[PDB]
Amino acid sequence: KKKRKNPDLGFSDYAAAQLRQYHRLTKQIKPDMETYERLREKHGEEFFPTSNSLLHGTHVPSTEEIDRMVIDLEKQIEKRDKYSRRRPYNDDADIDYINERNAKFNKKAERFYG
RNA sequence: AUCGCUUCUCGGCCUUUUGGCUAAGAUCAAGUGUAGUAUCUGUUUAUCAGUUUAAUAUCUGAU
């Protein structure tokens, strides 16, 4: 059995959050060594190109593949859509604001003047 | 313990949100007494007796 934890911190740079998300997505993927070997026995030495070494024009993908990336796109898009968790419209406390822009400005002022 | 779904709670974003300047740009606010106008609003009580009138009505009188 296995165990780990990862706590959230400051967004410090957009890079940090991006990196966390990449970690998760990367861990998810599971590759088929079948297709890997199939692709391998055709091309051989072309498999291991340096930045500058080797070249074959284009690798054309079966559509079924393309569907995988499209699906992952939609998933990540949703997960990103949920970035900001909204606090429910609570009327219970005292109202001094005149509109929602004013309500939010009063909230930002509450953070900076204690 | 792990995975997923749902419910509530909390933290983080919340710049995504206070058009620029000058001589704070400059200045300041009084009253319903009289009438009338206009608009809505309401209308064109029950007999009978008389007075009256072209006829109504009015007037008078009990309801």
Side-chain angles (χ1 to χ4, degrees):
Chain A
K1 292 298 168 176
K2 306 251 269 203
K3 182 186 167 181
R4 215 194 91 189
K5 281 305 207 80
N6 210 226
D8 190 356
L9 56 141
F11 84 113
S12 57
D13 36 47
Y14 283 78
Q18 157 74 44
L19 173 54
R20 169 187 275 281
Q21 182 199 188
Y22 183 79
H23 263 290
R24 167 170 64 80
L25 301 160
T26 279
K27 171 176 159 175
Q28 256 202 329
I29 190 45
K30 280 167 181 86
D32 188 4
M33 304 320 287
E34 175 277 334
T35 185
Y36 189 30
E37 298 289 6
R38 193 271 170 285
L39 244 175
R40 180 149 181 196
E41 309 320 320
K42 201 202 322 300
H43 307 125
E45 290 47 51
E46 167 77 342
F47 246 166
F48 285 17
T50 91
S51 310
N52 61 349
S53 214
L54 261 307
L55 59 107
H56 262 321
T58 313
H59 157 61
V60 177
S62 94
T63 82
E64 204 262 9
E65 295 150 321
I66 317 197
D67 304 286
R68 318 158 32 156
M69 58 148 298
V70 185
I71 292 155
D72 316 344
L73 246 291
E74 297 169 353
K75 293 177 178 169
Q76 309 171 211
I77 282 169
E78 167 189 352
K79 177 73 160 177
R80 166 169 65 218
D81 292 309
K82 193 45 56 139
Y83 191 42
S84 324
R85 83 165 189 73
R86 46 192 214 81
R87 295 82 206 290
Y89 202 21
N90 248 2
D91 338 55
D92 278 322
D94 156 33
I95 257 179
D96 32 329
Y97 74 77
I98 307 193
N99 32 9
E100 173 151 50
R101 276 193 302 208
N102 195 324
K104 186 33 183 209
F105 181 122
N106 289 317
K107 298 154 144 184
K108 193 176 39 161
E110 295 157 13
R111 237 89 51 167
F112 285 106
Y113 301 116

